[PDB]
């Protein structure tokens, strides 16, 4: 039934012997064991797929049966020819390999055994710390101790004394101070020649050298006296233009120092007297009056004044100036990373009365000037006592100097993320203290204050504003690793972990290198100490202690985690270098590989080999082999049911009849990375071709090819030697010209210059010069990051014989849908068949992880049939619809876990429950692919030969699999073994001598390959766990599991006889046997389960994130709440904006507290705002731009494309999405305009003809006669926003490092420039231009669809071509000419856009109808305006009961199907408002092209010369809006052909062409139920 379609053409092909290696037999004798012999193993191994036979065709069990008849020949083995002779052997079948379950029970039960023995046994986490001090100490001897003089700087580089005092000036009051009679007082770090020499250097260029002056404020000191000289040469050598010092973690001194610290910044904040400023008016707009960004303002009188009592805190201890200070910072670091020389040095004054910064020339190091005044200095001294060089006193006044320090770019980012960071962590912190609640609840917002609190709760404010700055102005790779470590050591308040002591044994990394992490350290130790004194409500009896906050009287356990996982979650990604997270990514694979070579047996030198029969239940890397295909194979039959429905799903879905540009994954631009070099003859024969009478006509490739091998004779003369003895015959001629070039002298040499070689020169040089470097007799290639897409064109290229692109060869063939066209796997047997060839394996390379196009192709293949196993299983969750589907999967694992415990609670004799939250410990490298290889052969969806194409491409990817060292860091590292080390590490003896620039890994199958596959056998491990735990005798085990890759969330019931299993199982609880016993069983599977990062609870799951309770969800929106502060999408602002309130409605819907909402949507516009598109109180902003320009459109609805504000309500946000503010801006100005009531109202008077026609008309009376009002100014101004614009799109385009001159480097492009000549690089040229629109225009599905099949791909690549770190790039563009300035681009589109302009109706009445036409806004509104307050299942609690209820009550009510009134959401993409820019585009392009055709006819082109019958009817579609009038036939017309792309031409020749192509027409929208995963805590 069905019609199964022969999906390959390998219909011969065999999985053993007709393959291409001889890897099966092996795997054969590598699978027998005891008591099951040759014969039946591969018996079973290949006739396992009678088990499904009733759902099968008789042509599919035809050939798998003959399949099985050569196996058997090829195998020597006596076939069976019968049906019923095959169940007479399943019988013994089914008993032999029942019989695997039993013995693989005693074999965990006797690795439980030993792994219950000789561990040890830690009586304390006080005996672990000093156990892990300890084995630190004999690892590197003498550290610690109580000299803190040669630690760290414990503040860093965070530094604002608070000024009360009132950019110019700041530099001459510093010459004022700095020119009076020396009384320098130097202080030891915790109660000096380099304090004399840098006191010497600040005190000569503050006096002499601050006042040649380049760009106001960067000078340099070249004219000076000698002495000068010399004491600046000693500042500078004084700076410099194992060493570990650890502080241990009971250290009562350093704990006071740190407590003093604490309060001495306390008291050091408190004396700001700035009242206005850029973070201040931004956070006070969205703060002060937060109500606005509400709509059920008056329901709540509990609420609203405590988060401006929050404000108003952050404003008194100036935070929001202190965040000021460290934009302005990192903003000026940033623009001093410039074209300054050593010797040059720049002034940087923030916002602030009297900072000064004083950078010189890794990064860049700089001197500190700041004010104090006498009567708070002591506690200041306290504060900075380690990072103090000297202070002196003028009058009442004190000038302190500071120890210099160094930074990186990535760490100027993550300074510059400081004032997103530091606010949101003192509102959510101030949130999580039940004592700071009971403050501001009871007192008032007049009357908050510094000077008026109890004791208790000022230590706990200092702790949060100690936090506040240590959390979000982080620096230091200890501070990441001390972050790590309470990150993962967090699962102490449940049940068994096994790491609460042996995690900080082994893996803990103590690198605290200075001060003020001991108070981090303590208060999680404080916290652990507390726990081990010993819907879940934690902190009302547990009386635990905060981590970062210390913050007593917790009131739920979802404060500490939420409080824990912000301090985690703003921790930036790399804090250390590009070329150290390299180097460690390439040194992991190297050492696991190393450790799976050298346990397994093999040496560097072989081939990589099979199965030597050491893969049976071994501890290190094995398989059980005899269980693993039993396993597999009741995974497949209680999994897989009508097996050819749902592969002929995998044909329909999946598009395994398509052709391969039909796949987003293929065609999409994510880079492939491929192989590729210029040709040995191309070198030898410029090298002939260069005559010495040209020297100074050596322009092109040629002189880089001459600097390459110059550069090459300069350093490895023997190496090009042999090299041109290699490759040419004339090795003497090429030798003598070579000496004949060096002897003219007209060129230039270089000298070792690190990557600057690489940067400051042609690629085409030094990747010459690598090839005539590392030649050993093979060929040395690097890899190129191209399109992916350009690789599929190269392949369809070499696939329709054209291996040189002629012009020709395309529009001869493939006319029409019924021309020709390939399929997805006939384009990968291609695949194969040039992978087999014998080619120096260089198809099969990974590049840092990128993989090439081939291996993409194939493990594309394998992962995405891999799909349809596991979305039959409901078991398994890595087949998620993105969100959604996880946590609902996961719950209702749970509740179904709770219900069937409370249903057998009654009148049972024993029952217990446990789980286990797991990660595995390295799911890409511990882990064996050759189980894989056993994996496929078992699979019945496929038939002989694509089972067979699989094992053979597995087989060659763990063959020939080889990850490719970077040029750069293999320069740097040779280097350094050349004349440093003269030995290397783990990575160096797998190459030999670093000889080799490419090694091997095999058994690592890299991360993200492979992630369906191994997700599903992990489910099908747990399915195997299942049958294995109800084979022992006295219980009834119920185990229910959720999946992903690298994850495992593990449940578990018992019953009966439980102490007796207790005992048998050596454990004394559930969740710790079910820790051993998945342990064993998963090393058994070779699944290698971490020990630190699992945890066995009773009550609490933890999958990926987001645990739950006991039913009830832990919300954990702090993962939202810091990507909205430490990760943007950097590509504009309208687009930053974008995403970042995409994370803000995440914040929205994953269940945020009472207060931190206005804090976030300052967070959001804070980081836009002062990235891309630059805050208020300086150039480049917005709000000042219209108050200039003086247009009537007010503050609250400036729309964000140009520079407006994310002011839109909480309930548009978190219910549509991104589009709301400038959707609610549109709906309002509709409102006012049409001068009605309702959107009710809007709807009959919009959706009545002739209405909007004489509203023009009206308009256009009332601007010719001059009476316009604000109204119909804000009309028309958004009216030709629309019209020169989601909604709108990003308007100013600022273009990029523009690539016309690297588009050279596709070969797609230089296909172009070959088979079109030079013209069209950038008479002859117009002609041709003319046959390309030509073409065009016979052809418009070329531009206009997405390629529909051949002919219409690869010249669709060829023709998109007709027409013409990066966080730091534009803020030094944005002041920067990109020829014309981007503020004045601002000022000059208001100002040609304010304007009445003309034939405007058609952008106006699109505006109205697409907001008319938007469904789910049309029936937000209504319950919007329509919602009752309280009451009626609305609202009866305040604790966080708000932004659930009402919320979600009057949506998923007014779309029908819940009963709830709290649950946490995970919507879909319901609100798509990208149904009409497509539409608009691809007409637009049509436009464009049928516009410069007839540009290329004739010229004024108002109306045609009556040309053709396209150039007729294109005449009378731009004669009038051309997608507004087809649009206007298209409400009417419903042709929408069946697209044979044959009878599209018979039928009309301008309408069809640029309607139906698009694949739809303008038609209603849908909604859902917003998808409510699960409830939270109930409170009534």
Aim: glycine share 4%.
């Amino acid at each position: 039934v069905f019609f199964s379609h022969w999906t390959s053409k390998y219909k011969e092909r065999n999985p053993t012997e007709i393959a291409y290696s001889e890897d099966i037999e092996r795997i054969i004798d590598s699978l027998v064991t005891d008591e099951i012999t040759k014969e039946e193993i591969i018996h079973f191994l290949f006739g396992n797929f009678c088990f499904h036979i009733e759902t099968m065709n008789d042509q599919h069990i035809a050939d798998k049966f003959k399949g099985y008849q050569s196996s058997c020949i090829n195998l020597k083995i006596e076939p069976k020819v019968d049906l019923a002779d095959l169940k007479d052997h399943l019988i013994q079948k089914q008993q032999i390999w029942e019989s695997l379950y039993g013995k693989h029970l005693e074999k965990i039960m006797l690795r439980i055994r030993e792994k219950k023995k000789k561990e040890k046994e830690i009586p304390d986490i006080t005996t672990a710390f000093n156990q892990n001090a300890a084995e630190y100490e004999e690892k590197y001897p003498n550290c610690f101790t109580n000299d803190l003089s040669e630690t760290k700087t414990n503040f860093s580089m965070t530094w604002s004394p608070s000024f009360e005092k009132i950019n110019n000036a700041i530099i001459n009051k510093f010459r004022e101070s700095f020119k009076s009679s020396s009384r320098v007082i130097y202080n030891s770090p915790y109660s000096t020649n380099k304090a004399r020499d840098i006191t010497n250097l600040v005190r000569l260029c503050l006096t002499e050298l601050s006042c040649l002056t380049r760009n106001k404020n960067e000078f340099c000191m070249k004219e000076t006296g000698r002495e000068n000289k010399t004491i600046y040469f000693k500042g500078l050598a004084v700076m410099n233009i194992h060493m570990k010092k650890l502080i241990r973690h009971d250290n009562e001194d350093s704990l006071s120092w740190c407590e003093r610290i604490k309060d001495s910044l306390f008291v050091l904040h408190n004396g700001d007297i700035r009242e206005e400023g850029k973070i201040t008016s931004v956070y006070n707009n969205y703060a002060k009056n937060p109500e606005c960004l509400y709509i059920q303002d008056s329901v709540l009188k509990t609420e609203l004044e405590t988060c401006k009592k929050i404000n108003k805190l952050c404003n008194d201890l100036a935070i929001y100036h202190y965040s000021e200070d460290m934009m302005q910072f990192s903003k000026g670091l940033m623009v001093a990373d410039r074209y300054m020389t050593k010797e040059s040095f720049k002034i940087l004054t923030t916002a602030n009365t009297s900072m000064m910064l004083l950078a010189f020339k890794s990064g860049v190091p700089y001197i500190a000037l700041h004010i104090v005044d006498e009567d708070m200095s002591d506690q200041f001294n306290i504060c900075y006592t380690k990072e103090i060089y000297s202070y002196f006193r003028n009058g009442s006044n004190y000038i302190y100097i500071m120890r210099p320090q160094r930074l990186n770019q990535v760490r100027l980012l993550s300074l510059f993320k400081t004032p997103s960071k530091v606010p949101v962590c003192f509102a959510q912190f101030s949130k999580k203290a039940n004592e700071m609640e009971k403050w501001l609840k009871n007192k008032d917002i007049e009357k908050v204050n510094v000077f008026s609190m109890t004791m208790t709760v000022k230590q706990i404010l200092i702790n949060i504003v100690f936090s506040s700055v240590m959390i979000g102005t982080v620096t230091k790779l200890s501070r990441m690793g001390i972050f790590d470590f309470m990150r993962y050591a967090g699962f102490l308040p449940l049940s068994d972990y096994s790491n609460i002591k042996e995690y900080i044994r082994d893996k803990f990394d103590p690198d605290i290198t200075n001060v003020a992490d001991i108070y981090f350290v303590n208060g999680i130790k404080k916290l652990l100490f507390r726990m081990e004194d010993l819907d879940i409500i934690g902190g009302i009896t547990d009386l635990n202690i905060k981590c970062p906050i210390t913050g007593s009287t917790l009131l739920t356990l979802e404060d500490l985690y939420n409080n824990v996982y912000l301090a985690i979650y703003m921790m930036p990604k790399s804090l250390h270098n590009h070329v150290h997270n390299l180097t460690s990514l390439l040194n992991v694979p190297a050492e696991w590989e190393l450790k799976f070579r050298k346990e397994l047996g093999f040496n560097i030198f072989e081939d990589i080999y099979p199965k030597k029969a050491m893969f049976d239940d071994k501890d290190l890397f094995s398989i059980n082999g005899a269980l693993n295909v039993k396993a597999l194979s009741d995974y497949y039959l209680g999994n897989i049911e009508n097996v050819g429905l749902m592969r002929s799903e995998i044909e329909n879905k999946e598009d395994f009849l398509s052709p391969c540009y039909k796949i987003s994954t293929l065609k999409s631009s994510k880079k492939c990375s491929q192989s590729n070099i210029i040709s040995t003859d191309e070198i030898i024969e410029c090298l002939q071709n260069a005559k010495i009478q040209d020297i100074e006509n050596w322009k092109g490739n040629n002189l880089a090819i001459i600097k390459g091998l110059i550069r090459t004779y300069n350093e490895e003369k023997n190496r090009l030697v042999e090299f041109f003895e290699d490759n040419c015959v004339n090795s003497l001629y090429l030798v003598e010209k070579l000496k004949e070039i060096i002897n003219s002298g007209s060129i230039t040499v270089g000298k070792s210059v690190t990557s600057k070689f690489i940067r400051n020169n042609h690629p085409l040089t030094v990747e010459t010069y690598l090839k005539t470097k590392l030649y050993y007799r093979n060929n040395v290639t690097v890899l190129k990051s191209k399109k992916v897409s350009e690789e599929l064109y190269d392949l369809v290229k070499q696939f329709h014989n054209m291996m040189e692109i002629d012009l020709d060869s395309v529009m001869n063939l493939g006319k029409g849908t019924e021309g020709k066209k390939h399929t997805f796997l006939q384009m990968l047997e291609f695949v194969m068949s040039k992978a087999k060839n014998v080619t120096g394996s260089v198809d099969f390379l990974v590049s840092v992880y990128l993989m090439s196009m081939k291996v993409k192709m194939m493990l594309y293949f394998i992962e995405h049939t891999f799909k349809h196993v596991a979305q039959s299983d409901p078991s398994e969750a890595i087949s998620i619809s993105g969100d959604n589907k996880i946590r609902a999967l996961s719950t209702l694992s749970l509740d179904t876990i709770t219900s069937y415990n409370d249903i057998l609670n009654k009148n049972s004799k024993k029952s217990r429950l446990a789980f286990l939250s797991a990660d595995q410990s390295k799911w890409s490298a511990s882990d064996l692919t050759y189980k894989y290889v056993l994996a496929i052969i078992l699979n019945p969806i496929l038939t002989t030969g694509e089972a067979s194409l699989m094992i053979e491409c597995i087989l060659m990817y763990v063959k020939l699999k080889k990850v490719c060292i970077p040029t750069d860091i293999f320069l740097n590292l040779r280097k350094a073994q050349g004349t440093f080390g003269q030995n290397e590490t783990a990575i160096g003896l797998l190459t030999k001598g670093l000889t080799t620039n490419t090694y091997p890994v095999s058994m690592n199958w890299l991360q993200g390959n492979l992630n369906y596959l191994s997700s599903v056998y992990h489910s099908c491990a747990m399915k195997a766990y299942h049958k294995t735990l109800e084979c022992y005798k006295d219980c009834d085990f119920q185990t229910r599991w959720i999946v992903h890759s690298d994850d495992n969330a593990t449940s578990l019931i018992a019953s009966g006889e439980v102490d007796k299993m207790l005992t048998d199982f050596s454990s004394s609880s559930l969740p710790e046997m079910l820790f051993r016993s998945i342990e064993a069983h998963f090393k058994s599977f070779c699944i290698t389960l971490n020990p630190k990062k699992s945890y066995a609870s009773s009550s609490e799951v933890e999958f990926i994130s987001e645990r739950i309770v006991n039913g009830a969800i832990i919300p954990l929106y702090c993962r939202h709440l810091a990507n909205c502060c430490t990760e943007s999408s950097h590509i504009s602002y309208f687009d930053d904006l974008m995403s970042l309130s995409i994370h803000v409605t995440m914040l929205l819907r994953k269940g945020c507290p009472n207060e931190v909402i206005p804090f976030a949507y300052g967070a959001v516009q804070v980081q836009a705002l002062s990235i891309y598109s630059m805050l208020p109180g300086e150039v480049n902003d917005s709000i000042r731009i219209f108050k200039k320009l003086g247009v009537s459109l007010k503050s609250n609805e400036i729309p964000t494309n140009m520079g407006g504000w994310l002011t839109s309500p909480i309930e548009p946000l978190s219910i549509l999405g991104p589009s709301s503010n400038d959707q609610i801006i549109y709906y309002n100005v509709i409102r006012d305009f049409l001068n009605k009531k309702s959107l009710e109202e809007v709807k009959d008077s919009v959706s009545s003809s002739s209405y909007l026609q004489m509203r023009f008309r009206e308009l256009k009376g009332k601007y010719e006669k001059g009476t316009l009002e604000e109204k119909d100014k804000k009309m028309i101004f958004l009216i030709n926003l629309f019209e020169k614009a989601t909604m709108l799109t990003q308007i100013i385009k600022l273009p990029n490092f523009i690539n016309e001159n690297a588009l050279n480097k596709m070969s797609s492009y230089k296909d172009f420039s070959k088979l079109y000549p030079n013209l069209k690089k950038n008479i002859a040229s117009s002609l041709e231009m003319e046959s390309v629109h030509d073409i065009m225009i016979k052809n418009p599905e070329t531009i206009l669809i997405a390629p529909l099949n051949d002919r219409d791909f690869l010249l669709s690549q060829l023709f998109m071509y007709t027409s013409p770190k990066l966080a730091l790039d534009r803020v030094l563009r944005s002041k920067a000419r990109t020829k014309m300035t981007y503020e004045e681009n601002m000022e000059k589109k208001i100002l040609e856009m304010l304007k009445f302009d003309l034939d405007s109706y058609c952008s106006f009445k699109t505006c109205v109808n697409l907001v008319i036409k938007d469904v789910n806004f049309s029936m937000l509104i209504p319950i919007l305006d329509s919602a009752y307050p309280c009451e009626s299942r609305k609202r009866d609690n305040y604790n966080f009961r708000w932004f659930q209820t009402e919320k979600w009550i009057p949506v998923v009510e007014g779309s029908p199907g819940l009963v709830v009134m709290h649950a946490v959401y995970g919507s879909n993409y319901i609100e798509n408002l990208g149904l009409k820019n497509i539409p608009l585009t691809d007409d637009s392009i049509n436009v464009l092209t049928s516009t410069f055709g007839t540009g290329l006819i004739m010229e004024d082109v108002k109306s045609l010369v009556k040309g053709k019958d396209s150039f007729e009817t294109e005449a009378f579609s731009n004669s009038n809006e051309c997608q507004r009038l087809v649009k206007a036939c298209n409400y009417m017309i419903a042709a929408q052909n069946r697209l044979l792309a044959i009878n599209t031409c018979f039928t009309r020749k301008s309408f069809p062409f640029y309607s139906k192509f698009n694949l739809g027409r303008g038609f209603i929208s849908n909604t859902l139920a917003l998808l409510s995963t699960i409830y939270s805590k109930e409170e009534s």
